[PDB]
């Protein structure tokens, strides 16, 4: 038992030298780079179309591949895929588990997914059954609630859960292909990489963990928050990670420099952050708060780019299109809004 | 092509007809999240169990199988019309966990407006435990000395005054947690029951009626 204590002290002295080493690679700050950069200053957006028709709150939404179709996830059961150009519904899929929590969209536009509280990630087929859309593949196997699901390829699906597991799944067998354990709290959201080789996971542990897709071990473990990690999304190349917390502190972490680059807090903000997903540029971050309004922040220059208000209740999920032509927010008043 | 837009408009009208049926179906049923301590008579109080009283169908949504944490999936239950609680009024070793829990359900951020009902369950076991007199409430609760029976207490004939004093102390303890931050928006209706009677669904129907009447009267500012 004493050698396990020596093991713990060995761990402590080693991460002491590592956390002192990580400071050694960072002598300047990000504030010394925003001195010769032309800021945006003010920018605002006019609401274009409001997709209405849901009966209870909107919990998550996912953008399409062509940036025309989106998929919306009500909490009365309905999973409705909309065409955002003509402002019209394409399909309305009733469900088994009413309490959905996150949906996603295929890279080929063929399949959708439904993460539930009833512990079964269902996968639905769309374009091969234009009539009578039924449940294609159930993905039972978790114990806790499933909290975020995406599509790696059209055969591979990355589902995070509540029992800390965060497993990678294969549709053809219905079996847990690769498990990524290591956490000790509720894991809330995932965000896939461009190369589909990495992915970043934020949990209740106030920590982010960057994982490979193949071996299955934690490569990186970032920290620095004082509460839950409530959503993450990150840069289009795979070297900078934007993290939204419950302490209202948006953070921008680096993979190459390995340390937390940017913090953002303010004094007028005591509401926690529900979703952060940001633009094709390295300028705009988009945050959603519990004060019922979206806040567009500028990345390198920590100043208010703008406020997108207009919701009746808490914003629950956010989405930027692939081509940047729109920004959609979905709040707890059953009204999606598209902004450009 | 404009004709595929016309087929899209016909499918849109069919989908809007689908949503109109399910709007009437969803507004018909009243969700009721039921959570409570385990081994506290939870299941016999009538996942999803649907029961009908007077042509109204309540979808009592018990939650089980999740790990022992709230505050990530308890924020998903803020559109329900009640929150049924069930606690054990006999086992005094778990009253303090229940008191801290229902203090946390009262003062959470997104469950402010949702008004809990209270089912004190296993009632005659409390009567047996206070007739036998093996363990006192003063061993756990040091506040039982400075308390007497309330006047609105309805004593059961053939039951001791120590029975009524102990039971109404537990009820007044829960209500003393209630009235500290309750602002007239959400109330806590207590109820004593055993595991034997099947009259409880009538009482849930009457008190869900009271919650919806008070919700409609707060919109017109009359009350």
């Amino acid at each position, epitope marked *: 038992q004493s050698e396990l204590d020596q093991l713990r002290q060995e761990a402590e002295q080693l991460k002491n030298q590592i956390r002192d080493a990580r400071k050694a690679c960072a002598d300047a700050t990000l504030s010394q780079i925003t001195n010769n950069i032309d800021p945006v200053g003010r920018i605002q957006m006019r609401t274009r179309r409001t997709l209405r028709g849901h009966l209870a709150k909107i919990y998550a939404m996912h953008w399409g591949t062509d940036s025309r179709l989106l998929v919306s996830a009500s909490q009365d059961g309905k999973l409705i895929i909309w065409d955002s150009y003509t402002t019209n519904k394409v399909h309305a899929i009733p469900l088994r588990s009413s309490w959905v929590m996150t949906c996603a969209y295929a890279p080929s536009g063929n399949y959708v997914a439904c993460g539930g509280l009833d512990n079964i990630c269902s996968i639905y087929n769309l374009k091969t059954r234009e009539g009578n859309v039924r449940v294609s593949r159930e993905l039972a196997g978790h114990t806790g609630y499933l909290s975020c699901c995406r599509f790696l390829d059209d055969n591979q699906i990355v589902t995070s859960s509540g029992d800390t597991t965060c497993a990678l799944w294969d549709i053809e067998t219905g079996q847990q292909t690769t498990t990524f354990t290591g956490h000790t709290g509720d894991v809330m959201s995932l965000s896939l990489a461009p190369d589909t080789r990495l992915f970043v996971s934020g949990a209740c542990d*106030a920590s982010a963990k960057l994982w490979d897709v193949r071996e299955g071990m934690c490569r990186q473990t970032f920290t620095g928050h004082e509460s839950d990690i409530n959503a993450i999304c990150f840069f289009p190349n795979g070297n900078a990670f934007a993290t939204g917390s419950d302490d209202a502190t948006c953070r921008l972490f680096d993979l190459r420099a390995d340390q937390e680059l940017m913090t953002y807090s303010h004094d007028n903000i005591i509401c926690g952050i529900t979703s952060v997903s940001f633009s094709k540029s390295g300028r705009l971050l988009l945050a959603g708060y519990d004060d019922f309004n979206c806040n567009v922040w500028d990345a390198l220059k920590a100043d208010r780019a703008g406020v997108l208000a207009g919701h009746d209740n808490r914003v629950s999920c956010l989405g930027v299109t692939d081509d940047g032509m729109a920004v959609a927010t979905g709040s707890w008043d059953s009204f999606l809004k598209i902004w450009n | 092509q404009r004709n595929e837009e016309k087929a899209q408009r016909e499918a849109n009208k069919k989908i809007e007809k689908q949503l109109q049926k399910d709007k009437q179906v969803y507004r018909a049923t009243h969700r009721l999240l039921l959570l409570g301590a385990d081994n506290s008579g939870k299941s016999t109080i009538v996942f999803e169990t649907k029961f009908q009283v007077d042509k109204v169908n309540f979808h009592m949504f018990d939650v089980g199988g999740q790990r022992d*944490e709230r*505050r990530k999936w308890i924020q998903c239950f803020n559109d329900v019309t009640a929150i049924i609680f069930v606690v054990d009024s006999s086992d005094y070793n778990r009253l303090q966990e229940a008191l801290n829990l229902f203090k946390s359900i009262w003062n959470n*951020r997104w469950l402010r407006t949702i008004s809990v009902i209270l089912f004190l369950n296993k009632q005659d076991l409390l009567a047996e435990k206070v007739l036998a007199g093996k363990s006192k409430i003063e061993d756990y609760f040091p*506040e039982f000395a400075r308390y007497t029976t309330p006047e609105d207490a309805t004593p059961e004939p053939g039951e001791d005054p120590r029975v009524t004093r102990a039971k109404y102390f537990i009820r007044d303890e829960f209500l003393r947690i209630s009235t500290a931050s309750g602002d007239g928006r959400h109330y806590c209706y207590p109820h004593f029951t055993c595991a034997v009677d099947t009259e409880n669904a009538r009482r849930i129907f009457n008190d869900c009626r009271d919650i919806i009447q008070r919700m409609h009267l707060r919109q017109y500012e009359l009350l």
Partner: nanobody
Amino acid sequence: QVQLQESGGGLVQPGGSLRLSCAASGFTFSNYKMNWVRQAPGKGLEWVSDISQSGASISYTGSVKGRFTISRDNAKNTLYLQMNSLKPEDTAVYYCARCPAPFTRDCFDVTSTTYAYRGQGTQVTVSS
């Protein structure tokens, strides 16, 4: 970055007095709740005492009413729990536990199988 360490413990004769001190670093200490939660062997987790963000509302619960008293130091990032008149049943491990979110009147930390914001704690025992 959030770290919590604890100090005190040992064997103390029944009738003794002890001072449990919890030191935490990595956050802003002054703006949310604090709880003191003990672990008895053979049983689960049981919650002992609570203090608010300033020291305004304090409540002790169970059979530790009056004989114990807690307070806190905002500027030194510290929790104090002064205990008098111990017993054989207070043989326990003692963890200082934290509210999960700032500016809340709610707290679910005690009856957790695992949690993310409480330290590994001290051990108090009595002689017999």
